[PDB]
Amino acid sequence: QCVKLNDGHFMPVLGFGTYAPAEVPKSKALEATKLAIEAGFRHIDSAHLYNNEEQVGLAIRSKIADGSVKREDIFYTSKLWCNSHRPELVRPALERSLKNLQLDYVDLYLIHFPVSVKPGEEVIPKDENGKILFDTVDLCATWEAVEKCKDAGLAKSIGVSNFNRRQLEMILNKPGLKYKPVCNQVECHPYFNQRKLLDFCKSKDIVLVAYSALGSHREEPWVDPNSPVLLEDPVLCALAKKHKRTPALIALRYQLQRGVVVLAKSYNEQRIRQNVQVFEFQLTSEEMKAIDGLNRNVRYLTLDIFAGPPNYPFSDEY
Ligand SMILES: NC(=O)c1ccc[n+]([C@@H]2O[C@H](COP(=O)([O-])OP(=O)(O)OC[C@H]3O[C@@H](n4cnc5c(N)ncnc54)[C@H](OP(=O)(O)O)[C@@H]3O)[C@@H](O)[C@H]2O)c1
Ligand SMILES: Cc1ccc(Cl)c(Nc2ccccc2C(=O)O)c1Cl
């Protein structure tokens, strides 16, 4: 149920997504994460950006309090947001997440997105024309500061998110590198299966962690409603009928069988319980190949909001 990371720690291969659209009230993240843990999730994904770490930590700590799990059974990821890329601000951001969580360490701390914005409590600062107030930070300098968080024991493992290949080689080839990224958390699903980036990550012992593995929240204005609905896919639905599963389950199983660690968000008790059944069955080689054909280079989360600056990850081929 776990993949060994390039730093020797273990990451459960199914992870619970906690991000939800802003309209969802904060209290739902607490109850959803508790259900997820009860249902069998041990890997929990959050971030400063999500504004739920107080609730997600309470949920985690509640299931420790009631004897469900031990701290060491839980793999909790946080992420450094773009307003704290500056080296001096990286540890303060990690310590703020920890005080919010009331946890002593995160199992994994990621650079969330490689484009920096102006420091300040505003996660998306903007000028009067509505344009983003970008910042100028050496991402290698950011990484050195993330590394010291591992030195200090505040983050068991460290990694990146939304990095392309050239950005991974920039970390990888940096002089004096102490710690490789253990993972690169990116959008990945049968409509955007990241085959090329996945093959690169493997080459460097970097785990690819798939987000929007189920086709994403589809929340406007982040995703176009005219994009195809992954979970309405004819092939996924046929494999669902054949296996007596669901299309979400097919989508999730596909990643596990190609060596991708897979996130899955849901605030619904029924589907939270359904999704941990990804371990109960398996796809054949021919079904895997059919799902491979579904690729349409369809990115749900383009994050145009942050395009323009060079660090914008999604302009390269991969
Ligand atoms: N840049 C980043 O690092 C980044 C970006 C995006 C996401 N993420 C992270 O990774 C997670 C990925 O999820 P996501 O939020 O993009 O969405 P997702 O996991 O791809 O899909 C979530 C959506 O699918 C629905 N769903 C869940 N289980 C289902 C099931 N069994 N059957 C049918 N529908 C189901 C959910 O509705 P219900 O809640 O009603 O079930 C919700 O509308 C996020 O929560 C977040 O932790 C990271
Ligand atoms: C503005 C901006 C820029 C980059 C990312 Cl990664 C995000 N993050 C998300 C955007 C939409 C939905 C979910 C997220 C997420 O990171 O989970 C945002 Cl809000």
Task: Give the chain's domains with CATH numbers.
Answer: 1-318 (3.20.20.100)
d(CA 123, CA 125): 6
305 phi, psi to nearest 5 deg: -45, -30
| 132, 305 Cβ separation under 8 angstroms | yes
Query: Is there an atom of ligand 2 within 6 Å of 192 CB?
Result: no
Helix 87-101 vs helix 53-65: angle between axes, to the nearest 10 degrees?
50
Q: How many CB atoms lie within 10 A of CB 117?
A: 23
Burial of 140 (0-12, 13-18, 19+ CB in 10 A): middle
The closest residue, in CA terms, to atom 10 on ligand 2 is 222
Closest CA relative to residue 211, chosen from 77, 53, 63, 54: 77
The closest residue, in CA terms, to atom 17 on ligand 1 is 216
Tokens of 114: 């490689």
| 264, 35 Cβ separation under 8 angstroms | no
Closest CA relative to residue 265, chosen from 189, 191, 207, 317: 189
d(CA 179, CA 120): 28
213 strand-pairing partners:
none
d(CA 269, CA 196): 35
178 alpha carbon to ligand 1 midpoint, in Å?
33
Tokens of 229: 């609905």
Query: Is there an atom of ligand 1 within 6 Å of 215 CB?
Result: yes
State the virtual CA torsion across 19, 9, 114, 138 in degrees, nearest 10.
Answer: 140
d(CA 104, CA 110): 17
Q: Is 298 left (phi over 0), alpha (psi -120 to 50) or beta?
A: beta
Burial of 223 (0-12, 13-18, 19+ CB in 10 A): middle
The closest residue, in CA terms, to atom 29 on ligand 1 is 271
d(CA 185, CA 139): 17
| 79, 209 Cβ separation under 8 angstroms | no
d(CA 110, CA 185): 8
Which residues does 128 contact at the CB level (< 8 Å), separation at least 6? none
d(CA 160, CA 182): 8
Q: How many CB atoms lie within 10 A of CB 187?
A: 21
| 248, 231 Cβ separation under 8 angstroms | yes
Closest CA relative to residue 289, chosen from 170, 225, 147, 193: 193
214 alpha carbon to ligand 1 midpoint, in Å?
6
d(CA 236, CA 241): 9
Closest CA relative to residue 145, chosen from 135, 132, 155: 155
Q: How many CB atoms lie within 10 A of CB 153?
A: 9
217 alpha carbon to ligand 2 midpoint, in Å?
11
C-alpha distances in Å from residue 285, one per residue of 13, 190, 317: 20, 15, 27
* Helices within 50-160 (DSSP H only): 53-65, 87-101, 139-151
Query: Is there an atom of ligand 1 within 6 Å of 212 CB?
Result: yes
Tokens of 36: 């997820």
109 annotated active-site: no
Note the ligand closest to the C-alpha atom of 50: 2
Q: Is 32 helix (H, G, I), strand (E, B) or coil?
A: helix
302 alpha carbon to ligand 2 midpoint, in Å?
9
| 186, 161 Cβ separation under 8 angstroms | yes
C-alpha distances in Å from residue 221, one per residue of 37, 225, 311: 31, 9, 22
Burial of 81 (0-12, 13-18, 19+ CB in 10 A): buried
Residue of 23, 211, 231, 269 with the most ligand 1 atoms within 8 Å of its CB, for mutation: 211
d(CA 208, CA 241): 28
79 strand-pairing partners:
110
Does a cis peptide bond (omega within 30 degrees of 0) precede residue 221? yes
Letter string b/e over residues 19-36, b meaning 16 or more CB atoms within 10 A of that residue's CB: bbeeeeeeeebbebbbbb
Identity at 7, one-letter amino acid code: D
290 phi, psi to nearest 5 deg: -60, -45
Resolution in A: 2.2
Element (H, E) at 254: helix 247-257
Residue of 265, 273, 314 with the most ligand 1 atoms within 8 Å of its CB, for mutation: 265
Q: E strands within the chain?
A: 2-4, 10-12, 14-17, 43-45, 75-80, 106-111, 155-161, 183-187, 207-211, 261-265
Tokens of 4: 């060994």
Tokens of 187: 């959008």
